[PDB]
Paper text:
PARP4 is an ADP-ribosyltransferase that uses NAD+ as a substrate to synthesize ADP-ribose modifications on molecules. However, PARP3 and PARP4 contain the catalytic triad H-Y-E but are considered MARylation enzymes, indicating that other structural features are important determinants of catalytic output.
We also determined structures of the PARP4 ART domain alone (CATΔHD), which provided higher-resolution insights into the active site configuration that gives rise to PARP4 mono(ADP-ribosylation) activity. The CATΔHD/NADH crystals diffracted to 2.55 Å and belong to space group C2221 with three PARP4 molecules in the asymmetric unit. The structure was determined by molecular replacement using a truncated version of the PARP4 CAT/EB47 structure with the ligand removed. Two PARP4 molecules had NADH in their active sites, whereas the active site of the third molecule was empty due to a nearby crystal contact. The structure was refined to a crystallographic R/RFREE of 0.211/0.254. The structure of the PARP4 ART domain bound to NADH was compared to the closely related ART domains of PARP1, PARP2 and PARP3 in order to investigate the structural basis for the MARylation activity of PARP4.
Author numbering: 316 to 358, 367 to 571
The structure:
């Protein structure tokens, strides 16, 4: 029978929908989340198509010599005011199933921004999107429960800032940050902390903590961009990078 032969070929055609670089990434962030849960509680290579399908998130490797790679690499490094050595390893286009249709692009002032996260959050971030934190209300609100601009989703325009939240993973020591389209809308500039915010001030859609300078002192070392609605955010790229300062 040739119906037998046709189904084995269809298996091959299904498996190849996952590239090698994306399959590697899926296993690493999956290894990192499992390794982290295991550690909380004590205790080439075949395709990991089941793990990738469970992310419900499309991931395409962008090749190191293409126009897209060199441009997006450039944009990531554009505001690296630390001048600390960074090796942009890999770049991935990312697409969540519902993110593209719920995005509030019509607010205007859409900017691409950086969001750093530890590696063990990445599987959850790809499956669910960036989520709002839970607001504290039954006990006193503490500064370990709240960003310095309240209960929102935090971005920066600077790779120097993102490096403070993209910690090296225990698996392979590399760092991940996200590049997101953020619908900033009417963006209010702030020079002082405000832990109590749960939405942008009246008439504004987002908030900007202005980074301190010699002329203008502020409460913010870094530039922070904060939105308070998950649909003001659309993930676009995953960036894998490393820092040699990190070795030895
Ligand atoms: N996160 C950043 O890249 C930046 C953070 N900041 C600074 O950091 C503070 C806020 O730190 P954050 O870690 O951003 O916020 P946070 O203290 O509210 O922590 C929430 C964490 O949950 C993660 N997360 C969000 N949705 C998730 C999901 N669906 N699954 C799994 N994990 C998910 C985020 O990556 C984030 O690290 C601010 O006070 C400011 O000083 C400001 C600029 C950029």
């Amino acid at each position: 029978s040739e119906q037998l032969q046709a189904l084995l070929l269809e298996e091959v055609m299904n498996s190849s929908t996952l590239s090698q670089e994306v399959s590697d990434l899926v296993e690493m962030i999956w290894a990192e989340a499992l390794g982290h849960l295991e550690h909380m509680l004590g205790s080439p290579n075949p395709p990991s198509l089941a793990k990738y399908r469970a992310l419900r998130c499309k991931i395409e490797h962008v090749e190191q010599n293409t126009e897209e790679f060199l441009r997006v690499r450039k944009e990531v490094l554009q505001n690296h005011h630390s001048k600390s050595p960074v090796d942009v390893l890999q770049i991935f286009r990312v697409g969540r199933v519902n993110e593209t249709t719920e995005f509030l692009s019509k607010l205007g002032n859409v900017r691409p921004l950086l969001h750093g996260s530890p590696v063990q959050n990445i599987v959850g971030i790809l499956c669910r999107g960036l989520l709002l934190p839970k607001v504290v209300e039954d006990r006193g609100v503490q500064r370990t429960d709240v960003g310095n601009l309240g209960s929102g989703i935090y971005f920066s325009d600077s790779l120097s800032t993102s490096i403070k939240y993209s910690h090296p993973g225990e698996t392979d020591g590399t760092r991940l940050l996200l590049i997101c389209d953020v619908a900033l809308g009417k963006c209010m500039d702030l020079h002082e902390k405000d832990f109590s915010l749960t939405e942008a001030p009246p008439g504004y859609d987002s908030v900007h903590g202005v980074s301190q300078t010699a002329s203008v002192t502020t409460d913010f070392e870094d530039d922070e961009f904060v939105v308070y609605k998950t649909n003001q955010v659309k993930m676009k790229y995953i960036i894998k990078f490393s820092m040699p300062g990190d070795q030895i």
